[PDB]
């Protein structure tokens, strides 16, 4: 069966550990534990097909990995969080497609932005500020809540189905 290799990255805090674990495990993880670098393998099946979702978690605590950047090489796909009430996470996410751009050797990977706590009233990045920015990567904007479900599987899904027009 096909495998697909999705990395999920950007800053500290903005939610990419209680996605992944939303999408895998079907709970909201309520506690910030700091990730150093995490696998999940789960068989789902999506548009008809039994895929094989391999997902590294990876640290937005600049501290780990230094070389964060090996882990992310096999990455096919990569989802790039940031959190909707955190203003910096937003404008994080640059340094981090560029880190992408880097360890694919390429500025054409599959890629969704996501902009992550969607459940939160807090917000200071609106929708349509994420959108524009989407839009000049070429790639899709999905918000998202780890906390509710709310778009969880959208953006895993529509990574895949990024990675399948690549
Ligand atoms: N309300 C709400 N809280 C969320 C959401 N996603 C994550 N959180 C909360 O935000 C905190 C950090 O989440 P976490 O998934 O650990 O973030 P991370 O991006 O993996 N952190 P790190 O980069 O350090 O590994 C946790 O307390 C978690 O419960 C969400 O969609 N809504
Ligand atoms: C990453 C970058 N791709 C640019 C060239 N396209 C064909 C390669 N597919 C696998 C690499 N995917
Ligand atoms: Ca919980
Ligand atoms: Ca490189
Ligand atoms: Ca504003
Ligand atoms: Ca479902
Ligand atoms: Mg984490
Ligand atoms: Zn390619």
């Given at each position: 069966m096909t495998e697909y290799k999705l990395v999920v990255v950007g800053?500290?805090?903005?939610g990419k550990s209680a996605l992944t674990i939303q999408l895998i495990?079907?709970?909201?993880?309520?506690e910030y534990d700091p990730t150093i670098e995490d696998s999940y393998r789960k068989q789902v099946v999506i548009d008809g097909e039994t895929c094989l979702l391999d997902i590294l978690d990876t640290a937005?605590?600049?501290?780990?990995?230094?070389?964060?950047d090996q882990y992310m090489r096999?990455?096919?796909?990569?989802?790039c969080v940031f959190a909707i009430n955190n203003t910096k996470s937003f404008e994080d996410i640059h340094q981090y497609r560029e880190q992408i751009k880097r360890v694919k050797d390429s500025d054409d990977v599959p890629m969704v932005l996501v902009g992550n706590?969607?459940?939160?009233?807090?917000?200071?990045?609106?929708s349509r500020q994420a959108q524009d920015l989407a839009r000049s990567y070429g790639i899709p904007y999905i918000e998202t809540s780890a906390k509710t479900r709310q778009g969880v599987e959208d953006a895993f899904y529509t990574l895949v189905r990024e990675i399948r027009q690549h």
């Open positions: 800053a500290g805090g903005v495990q079907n709970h909201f993880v309520d937005g605590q600049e501290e780990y990995s230094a070389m964060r096999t990455g096919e796909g990569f989802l706590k969607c459940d939160l009233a807090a917000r200071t990045v609106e």
